């Protein structure tokens, strides 16, 4: 009956709680108290491009390591050139809400998305010069929070009606579906493997899903707020989130523990975006308190404070040739450090 | 051109000078620093307020010499170099810095009366612009009696700078352009004006009573001390001017207004120390600042 | 019983949930602190690399 | 640098132009954002405005550019998400006031919107539509039977009107910072743009003299 | 995408003529625009080049002053204007497009052009036709003087075709780049001052007559080519 499904649920929690009790042993702290600090890093801004009107919320950077995307909320997708500061294309919008952008591993096509319910992709190569839109995906109840791409016809979708698709372009319908999050889901990425990928979903829950097989493998719950930002080791073990509690976290997919907490006294504002780095030492945050601050994998100690901007950093990036990382906020500037 | 009277004025003005540049140097110096910051967030107002607040150092830092004329009592001794250069700016900055008085007023009619027009007009590419006119034209205007060498020996081997109490030249017809002009025009601007704003804030609604009251306090406050600071110079000076003009015979009443003339210049000195602390101690955000 | 078929596959998913393989802790710390020492040179974000090649320098 | 990153720097350039060409545009711009029931009467107002997922309509009054966004079902968005609407002027509440009982669902609705953390700096305005019927039901309808504290006989227009009046201005909590406008419109009538554009005016004002003056 | 040319005819010793050229297909604003002229059975020649919106226009030291280039964004239209003609501009006239920015194709589309009848770096390339059989791979290498290693690491050398009756056709671009709808078999390297084109198992429609180019500064300079042909 429905009281023997509560009590067979608990029986099961209790189960999968005193089997993550057994697998602990020590603390990663104890792990790792040996190994040689990384020292202080001092950045410095070195390019800042300016041009947009109204405030950035977040973009991306692309494979050769030279072009990146923005994106504001006047209703403009502007390409950059990091090296020379030279705009290449400006691609005017029709909905002016956005909260996502993505470039594709090829380079031919581009993506955005908000409020409108309705995914848009770009062409950028035409033999007429012109960018024009190519498909408009649609069939969500909800607003678009974070989409990326996995191949040239592969697109993964998250939106705030506690659903995340997976679609086919051409075909334009949806070909798989995950279900079970409580809560509507903010943030994703995509493993390097390109086989799996995880989400937080503002339930203090993060949940793995399988690109072909369909369903959830884990779920990892030690939050105790809307998780605000994901992203991936690069090895493909371990993934990292930020929360409006003022703290990140670390994790592990096979040992299925939280590891790590870092944290401090000070902050008392929320995580916005969160990145690693070339080699899995550096946890780049960005903070409310106008600022963005490093830390460190196995020491959890700050290391700098990358300052310099007047309002609130929204969106973060690491390069993949491991050179430059890139912040976007509010007053309207894209600045690259190095 | 008769014996004057100076007896009764000896102190007053260099002892009152070494107060001001004591006390103007750090009010204008903040009020330039406060000024920085307006325009730095993208307002037109703190222009106008940092032009105000250099001229009126320059005024301070040629005061400490002036004094010595009074001082070391060497009736201009230092030679002509001086006396085409400190008397020009002497008599010439201090009716440029009510230009920028003006150009505040008008600013501020163009936003509380009306906050959606003039939008090319109160940008700060076209205020800057505005600016070097303003000070291109004053200099223009007052830079004829630099040309031409003041210096004339007295009856006590004294020697007067940029002034002789026979009104010999053409300084006579010159001042009275320095008067109707230079302080009469820029001062009805300021009353037609700060009237306006009053008028529209009592229609507002969303104001209240403490802040209706402030702004009530404020207007009257700029629209009196800049009558105090310099309406008793001016009033004498067209009168000692009228005595050459109408009959150059009569030299008695030229003789007082000479007490009064050194006693009423130090006086408009502390006009000075009205612009900083008037512009940037009153307002509570820039007191914060 | 849609109700009952909820809280039918929520103990379902919980039964995937049952059956996983784990590591140790140590064992799983290991890991992630060995791929850092064999990438150490080559981070430009730890180790400044001179300005000669650098091409936002 | 090679007769090609010349070009690129031209197309640079001419895109900056272009872009900068809007900006004025921009800068002079004043949004409005419409939330209302659905026995509001938005459609009617909607309607008679333009006569003289997320839509937007645009309208020009005075030489003035406006925006007003519609938003239809998203009302019940309560995360930070939702609040990048944190650049708009001004907030519309199309509200009925002829059913006594959707009066109370109203309220909580207001309560549930103005209080919002977020939207401290909008000027809130309140357009009591219908007051057409409410005329003729005051002399027949008693709003005693619903409400336990009106004093006058709910038979007084003017007795009425002061009554709700107050009931929606109490609401707003935390004092009041920003202004709230009211007005007893209908449909109609065609002075309702001049009306928002007086309001927002004043607001304007108020701005200016705080920025400016007295600081 | 479809580009005319039009204004050609017989004209005297002389005199003026206006040339016209028709765009239809594409953004014209957007695109900037060359003129380049043949000889009956010579070699090719830059003339002139005027930018996007008509901010900056470049002219060929052979003449000067006695040409004038204008665009007309609304209707489409480009045309040329001569004075005083002379027999050494007997020529058969084409049009070129090009667009430039990061990762672009320059020098990609050409007009059939029209006729015309009165009455610097150097190139290397020596025609010595080779004789050829279907199946077999060739080599065509074109020498340049100046070394054309810009130090932002960018090779500025393109390839060029043109069959009998036809007009050129853009293969190779900045020196490895294939352009776009060319077979795979084509393939080109070389360093700096060394240029060669790996052409692999030949095929039809492979005569005609081919030709290298440099873009490092301004004046453009061509080749004679080499007719690969049996």
């Given at each position: 009956?429905?009281?023997?499904?509560?009590?067979?649920?608990?029986?099961?929690?209790?189960?999968?709680?005193?089997?993550?009790?057994?697998?602990?042993?020590?603390?990663?702290?104890?792990?790792?108290?040996?190994?040689?600090?990384?020292?202080?890093?001092?950045?410095?801004?070195?390019?800042?491009?300016?041009?947009?009107?109204?405030?950035?919320?977040?973009?991306?950077?692309?494979?050769?390591?030279?072009?990146?995307?923005?994106?504001?909320?006047?209703?403009?997708?502007?390409?950059?050139?990091?090296?020379?500061?030279?705009?290449?294309?400006?691609?005017?919008?029709?909905?002016?809400?956005?909260?996502?952008?993505?470039?594709?591993?090829?380079?031919?096509?581009?993506?955005?998305?908000?409020?409108?319910?309705?995914?848009?992709?770009?062409?950028?190569?035409?033999?007429?010069?012109?960018?024009?839109?190519?498909?408009?995906?649609?069939?969500?109840?909800?607003?678009?929070?974070?989409?990326?791409?996995?191949?040239?016809?592969?697109?993964?979708?998250?939106?705030?009606?506690?659903?995340?698709?997976?679609?086919?372009?051409?075909?334009?319908?949806?070909?798989?579906?995950?279900?079970?999050?409580?809560?509507?889901?903010?943030?994703?990425?995509?493993?390097?493997?390109?086989?799996?990928?995880?989400?937080?979903?503002?339930?203090?829950?993060?949940?793995?899903?399988?690109?072909?097989?369909?369903?959830?493998?884990?779920?990892?719950?030690?939050?105790?707020?809307?998780?605000?930002?994901?992203?991936?080791?690069?090895?493909?073990?371990?993934?990292?989130?930020?929360?409006?509690?003022?703290?990140?976290?670390?994790?592990?997919?096979?040992?299925?523990?939280?590891?790590?907490?870092?944290?401090?006294?000070?902050?008392?504002?929320?995580?916005?975006?969160?990145?690693?780095?070339?080699?899995?030492?550096?946890?780049?945050?960005?903070?409310?308190?106008?600022?963005?601050?490093?830390?460190?994998?196995?020491?959890?100690?700050?290391?700098?404070?990358?300052?310099?901007?007047?309002?609130?950093?929204?969106?973060?990036?690491?390069?993949?040739?491991?050179?430059?990382?890139?912040?976007?906020?509010?007053?309207?500037?894209?600045?690259?450090?190095? | 051109?008769?014996?004057?009277?100076?007896?009764?004025?000896?102190?007053?003005?260099?002892?009152?000078?070494?107060?001001?540049?004591?006390?103007?140097?750090?009010?204008?110096?903040?009020?330039?620093?406060?000024?920085?910051?307006?325009?730095?967030?993208?307002?037109?107002?703190?222009?106008?307020?940092?032009?105000?607040?250099?001229?009126?150092?320059?005024?301070?830092?040629?005061?400490?010499?002036?004094?010595?004329?009074?001082?070391?009592?060497?009736?201009?001794?230092?030679?002509?170099?001086?006396?085409?250069?400190?008397?020009?700016?002497?008599?010439?900055?201090?009716?440029?810095?009510?230009?920028?008085?003006?150009?505040?007023?008008?600013?501020?009619?163009?936003?509380?009366?009306?906050?959606?027009?003039?939008?090319?007009?109160?940008?700060?590419?076209?205020?800057?612009?505005?600016?070097?006119?303003?000070?291109?034209?004053?200099?223009?205007?007052?830079?004829?009696?630099?040309?031409?060498?003041?210096?004339?020996?007295?009856?006590?081997?004294?020697?007067?700078?940029?002034?002789?109490?026979?009104?010999?030249?053409?300084?006579?017809?010159?001042?009275?352009?320095?008067?109707?002009?230079?302080?009469?025009?820029?001062?009805?601007?300021?009353?037609?004006?700060?009237?306006?704003?009053?008028?529209?804030?009592?229609?507002?609604?969303?104001?209240?009573?403490?802040?209706?009251?402030?702004?009530?306090?404020?207007?009257?406050?700029?629209?009196?001390?800049?009558?105090?600071?310099?309406?008793?110079?001016?009033?004498?000076?067209?009168?000692?001017?009228?005595?050459?003009?109408?009959?150059?015979?009569?030299?008695?009443?030229?003789?007082?207004?000479?007490?009064?003339?050194?006693?009423?210049?130090?006086?408009?000195?502390?006009?000075?120390?009205?612009?900083?602390?008037?512009?940037?101690?009153?307002?509570?955000?820039?007191?914060?600042? | 019983?849609?109700?009952?078929?909820?809280?039918?596959?929520?103990?379902?998913?919980?039964?995937?949930?049952?059956?996983?393989?784990?590591?140790?802790?140590?064992?799983?710390?290991?890991?992630?602190?060995?791929?850092?020492?064999?990438?150490?040179?080559?981070?430009?974000?730890?180790?400044?690399?001179?300005?000669?090649?650098?091409?936002?320098? | 640098?090679?007769?090609?990153?010349?070009?690129?720097?031209?197309?640079?350039?001419?895109?900056?132009?272009?872009?900068?060409?809007?900006?004025?545009?921009?800068?002079?711009?004043?949004?409005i954002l419409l939330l209302g029931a659905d026995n509001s009467g938005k459609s009617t107002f909607l309607?008679?405005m333009?006569?003289?997922?997320?839509?937007?309509?645009?309208?020009?009054?005075?030489?003035?550019?406006?925006?007003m966004?519609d938003?239809?079902?998203?009302?019940?968005?309560?995360?930070?998400?939702?609040?990048?609407?944190?650049?708009?002027?001004?907030i519309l509440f199309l509200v009925d006031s002829?059913?006594?009982?959707?009066?109370?669902?109203s309220?909580?609705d207001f309560?549930?919107?103005?209080?919002?953390?977020?939207?401290?700096?909008?000027?809130?305005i309140l357009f009591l539509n219908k007051t057409?019927?409410?005329?003729?039901?005051?002399?027949?309808?008693?709003?005693?039977?619903?409400?336990?504290?009106?004093?006058?006989?709910?038979?007084?227009?003017?007795?009425?009107?002061?009554?709700?009046?107050?009931?929606?201005?109490?609401?707003?909590?935390?004092?009041?910072?920003?202004?709230?406008?009211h007005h007893?419109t209908t449909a109609?009538?065609?002075?309702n743009?001049?009306?928002i554009?007086?309001?927002?005016?004043?607001?304007?004002?108020?701005?200016?003299?705080?920025?400016?003056?007295?600081? | 995408?479809?580009?005319?040319?039009?204004?050609?005819?017989?004209?005297?010793?002389?005199?003026?003529?206006?040339?016209?050229?028709?765009?239809?297909?594409?953004?014209?604003?957007?695109?900037?625009?060359?003129?380049?002229?043949?000889?009956?059975?010579?070699?090719?020649?830059?003339?002139?080049?005027?930018?996007?919106?008509?901010?900056?226009?470049?002219?060929?030291?052979?003449?000067?002053?006695?040409?004038?280039?204008?665009?007309?964004?609304?209707?489409?239209?480009?045309?040329?204007?001569?004075?005083?003609?002379?027999?050494?501009?007997?020529?058969?006239?084409?049009?070129?497009?090009?667009?430039?920015?990061?990762?672009?194709?320059?020098?990609?589309?050409?007009?059939?052009?029209?006729?015309?009848?009165?009455?610097?770096?150097?190139?290397?390339?020596?025609?010595?036709?080779?004789?050829?059989?279907?199946?077999?791979?060739?080599?065509?290498?074109?020498?340049?003087?100046?070394?054309?290693?810009?130090?932002?690491?960018?090779?500025?050398?393109?390839?060029?075709?043109?069959?009998?009756?036809?007009?050129?056709?853009?293969?190779?671009?900045?020196?490895?780049?294939?352009?776009?709808?060319?077979?795979?078999?084509?393939?080109?390297?070389?360093?700096?001052?060394?240029?060669?084109?790996?052409?692999?198992?030949?095929?039809?429609?492979?005569?005609?007559?081919?030709?290298?180019?440099?873009?490092?500064?301004?004046?453009?300079?061509?080749?004679?080519?080499?007719?690969?042909?049996?």
């Amino acid at each position: 009956e429905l009281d023997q499904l509560r009590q067979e649920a608990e029986q099961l929690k209790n189960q999968i709680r005193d089997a993550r009790k057994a697998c602990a042993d020590a603390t990663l702290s104890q792990i790792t108290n040996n190994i040689d600090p990384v020292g202080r890093i001092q950045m410095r801004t070195r390019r800042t491009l300016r041009g947009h009107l109204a405030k950035i919320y977040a973009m991306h950077w692309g494979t050769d390591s030279r072009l990146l995307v923005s994106a504001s909320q006047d209703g403009k997708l502007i390409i950059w050139d990091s090296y020379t500061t030279n705009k290449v294309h400006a691609i005017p919008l029709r909905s002016s809400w956005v909260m996502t952008c993505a470039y594709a591993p090829s380079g031919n096509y581009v993506a955005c998305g908000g409020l409108d319910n309705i995914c848009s992709i770009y062409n950028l190569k035409t033999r007429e010069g012109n960018v024009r839109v190519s498909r408009e995906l649609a069939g969500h109840t909800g607003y678009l929070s974070c989409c990326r791409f996995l191949d040239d016809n592969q697109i993964v979708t998250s939106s705030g009606d506690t659903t995340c698709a997976l679609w086919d372009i051409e075909t334009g319908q949806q070909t798989t579906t995950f279900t079970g999050h409580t809560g509507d889901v903010m943030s994703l990425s995509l493993a390097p493997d390109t086989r799996l990928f995880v989400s937080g979903a503002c339930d203090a829950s993060a949940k793995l899903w399988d690109v072909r097989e369909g369903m959830c493998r884990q779920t990892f719950t030690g939050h105790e707020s809307d998780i605000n930002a994901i992203c991936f080791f690069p090895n493909g073990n371990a993934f990292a989130t930020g929360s409006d509690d003022a703290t990140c976290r670390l994790f592990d997919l096979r040992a299925d523990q939280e590891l790590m907490t870092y944290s401090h006294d000070n902050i008392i504002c929320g995580i916005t975006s969160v990145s690693f780095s070339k080699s899995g030492r550096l946890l780049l945050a960005g903070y409310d308190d106008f600022n963005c601050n490093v830390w460190d994998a196995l020491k959890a100690d700050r290391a700098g404070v990358l300052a310099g901007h007047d309002n609130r950093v929204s969106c973060l990036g690491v390069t993949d040739d491991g050179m430059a990382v890139a912040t976007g906020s509010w007053d309207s500037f894209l600045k690259i450090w190095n | 051109g008769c014996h004057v009277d100076s007896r009764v004025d000896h102190l007053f003005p260099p002892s009152l000078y070494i107060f001001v540049i004591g006390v103007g140097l750090p009010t204008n110096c903040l009020a330039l620093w406060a000024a920085y910051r307006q325009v730095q967030q993208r307002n037109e107002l703190g222009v106008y307020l940092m032009n105000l607040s250099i001229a009126d150092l320059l005024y301070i830092c040629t005061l400490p010499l002036w004094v010595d004329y009074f001082l070391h009592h060497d009736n201009w001794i230092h030679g002509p170099g001086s006396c085409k250069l400190f008397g020009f700016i002497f008599y010439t900055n201090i009716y440029i810095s009510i230009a920028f008085l003006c150009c505040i007023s008008v600013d501020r009619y163009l936003a509380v009366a009306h906050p959606l027009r003039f939008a090319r007009l109160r940008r700060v590419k076209t205020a800057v612009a505005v600016s070097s006119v303003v000070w291109a034209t004053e200099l223009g205007a007052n830079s004829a009696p630099l040309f031409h060498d003041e210096l004339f020996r007295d009856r006590y081997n004294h020697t007067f700078c940029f002034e002789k109490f026979p009104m010999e030249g053409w300084v006579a017809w010159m001042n009275l352009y320095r008067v109707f002009v230079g302080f009469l025009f820029p001062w009805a601007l300021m009353l037609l004006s700060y009237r306006g704003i009053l008028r529209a804030v009592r229609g507002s609604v969303s104001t209240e009573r403490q802040e209706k009251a402030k702004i009530k306090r404020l207007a009257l406050s700029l629209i009196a001390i800049v009558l105090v600071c310099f309406a008793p110079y001016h009033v004498l000076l067209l009168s000692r001017s009228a005595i050459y003009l109408g009959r150059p015979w009569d030299c008695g009443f030229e003789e007082r207004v000479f007490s009064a003339y050194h006693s009423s210049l130090a006086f408009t000195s502390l006009n000075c120390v009205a612009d900083p602390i008037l512009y940037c101690l009153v307002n509570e955000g820039a007191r914060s600042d | 019983t849609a109700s009952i078929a909820q809280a039918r596959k929520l103990v379902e998913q919980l039964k995937m949930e049952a059956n996983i393989d784990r590591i140790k802790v140590s064992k799983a710390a290991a890991d992630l602190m060995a791929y850092c020492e064999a990438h150490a040179k080559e981070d430009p974000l730890l180790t400044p690399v001179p300005a000669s090649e650098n091409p936002f320098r | 640098v090679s007769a090609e990153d010349k070009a690129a720097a031209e197309r640079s350039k001419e895109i900056d132009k272009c872009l900068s060409r809007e900006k004025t545009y921009v800068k002079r711009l004043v949004k409005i954002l419409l939330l209302g029931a659905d026995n509001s009467g938005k459609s009617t107002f909607l309607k008679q405005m333009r006569i003289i997922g997320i839509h937007e309509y645009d309208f020009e009054i005075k030489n003035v550019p406006f925006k007003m966004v519609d938003v239809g079902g998203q009302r019940s968005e309560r995360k930070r998400w939702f609040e990048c609407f944190d650049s708009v002027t001004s907030i519309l509440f199309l509200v009925d006031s002829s059913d006594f009982n959707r009066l109370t669902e109203s309220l909580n609705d207001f309560e549930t919107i103005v209080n919002n953390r977020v939207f401290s700096n909008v000027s809130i305005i309140l357009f009591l539509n219908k007051t057409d019927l409410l005329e003729e039901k005051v002399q027949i309808v008693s709003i005693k039977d619903y409400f336990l504290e009106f004093e006058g006989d709910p038979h007084c227009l003017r007795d009425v009107q002061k009554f709700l009046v107050e009931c929606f201005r109490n609401k707003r909590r935390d004092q009041q910072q920003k202004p709230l406008y009211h007005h007893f419109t209908t449909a109609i009538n065609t002075e309702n743009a001049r009306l928002i554009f007086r309001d927002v005016k004043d607001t304007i004002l108020h701005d200016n003299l705080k920025q400016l003056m007295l600081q | 995408v479809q580009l005319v040319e039009s204004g050609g005819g017989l004209v005297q010793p002389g005199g003026s003529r206006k040339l016209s050229c028709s765009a239809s297909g594409f953004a014209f604003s957007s695109f900037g625009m060359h003129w380049v002229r043949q000889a009956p059975e010579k070699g090719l020649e830059w003339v002139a080049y005027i930018s996007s919106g008509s901010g900056t226009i470049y002219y060929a030291d052979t003449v000067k002053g006695r040409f004038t280039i204008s665009r007309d964004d609304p209707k489409n239209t480009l045309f040329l204007q001569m004075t005083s003609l002379r027999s050494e501009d007997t020529a058969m006239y084409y049009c070129v497009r090009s667009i430039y920015y990061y990762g672009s194709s320059p020098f990609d589309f050409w007009g059939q052009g029209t006729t015309l009848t009165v009455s610097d770096i150097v190139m290397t390339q020596a025609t010595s036709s080779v004789p050829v059989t279907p199946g077999e791979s060739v080599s065509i290498s074109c020498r340049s003087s100046k070394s054309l290693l810009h130090s932002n690491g960018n090779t500025y050398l393109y390839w060029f075709l043109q069959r009998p009756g036809q007009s050129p056709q853009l293969l190779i671009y900045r020196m490895s780049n294939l352009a776009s709808g060319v077979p795979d078999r084509f393939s080109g390297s070389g360093s700096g001052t060394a240029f060669t084109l790996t052409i692999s198992r030949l095929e039809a429609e492979d005569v005609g007559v081919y030709y290298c180019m440099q873009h490092l500064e301004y004046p453009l300079t061509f080749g004679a080519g080499t007719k690969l042909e049996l």
